[PDB]
């Protein structure tokens, strides 16, 4: 059945105005909250994956979204709250 999902809207105009690239926003959000497979390393002679992701405690609550900062072209750290809005909606966890 459909379940509550956290819809977040990146304001393109505001991100453009603050000098924050959409690639940096998407990577910061994806890597932190979803995890990102960077490259491989050698664990006791065997090739294995390297993953970056948020520590559990900073990707549990909706309010944690605003704790993540992206660096603009001018060098200023911008919180997600500055260039994003969010609401609750329903969507499929499994589309057949």
């Amino acid at each position: 059945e459909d379940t509550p999902q956290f819809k977040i809207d990146i304001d393109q105009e505001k991100a453009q105005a603050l000098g924050v690239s959409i690639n940096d926003i998407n990577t910061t959000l994806g890597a932190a909250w979803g995890g990102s497979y960077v490259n491989d390393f050698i664990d006791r002679g065997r090739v294995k994956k390297v993953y970056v992701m948020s520590e559990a405690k900073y990707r549990m609550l909706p309010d944690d979204i605003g704790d993540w900062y992206v660096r603009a072209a001018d060098g200023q750290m911008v919180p997600f709250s500055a260039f994003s809005s969010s609401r609750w909606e329903y969507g499929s966890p499994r589309l057949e």
Binding site: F41, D43, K49, V50, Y51, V52, E55
Partner: protein
């Protein structure tokens, strides 16, 4: 090793001080995913869910798997043991 990943230099500050990866992240040897957790009679366990290739003989494949596991057992760490919690082949052997 975690130690080597820990001393990855992210930036050198304006005063000459170093920002290492361990200064902005906890670095541990953990799973690719944290989705699947198995138990054997209440005890912590892992295992292999093996599926028969289309048209392949179940008994011959089961025998070939046991032959391959028999190769591995002698080089196991202390305490590690193979258990047989689900097999569809014994009934075939015994029923026939």
């Amino acid at each position: 090793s975690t130690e080597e990943f820990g001393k990855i230099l992210l930036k050198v500050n304006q005063d000459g001080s170093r920002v290492l990866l361990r200064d902005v992240a906890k670095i541990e040897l953990g799973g690719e995913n944290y989705d699947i957790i198995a138990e054997f009679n209440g005890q912590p366990a892992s295992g292999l869910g093996i599926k028969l290739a289309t048209g392949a003989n179940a008994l011959d494949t089961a025998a070939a798997i046991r032959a391959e596991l028999a190769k591995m057992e002698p080089f196991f760490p202390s305490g590690l043991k193979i258990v047989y919690p689900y097999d569809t082949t014994p009934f075939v052997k015994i029923s026939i």
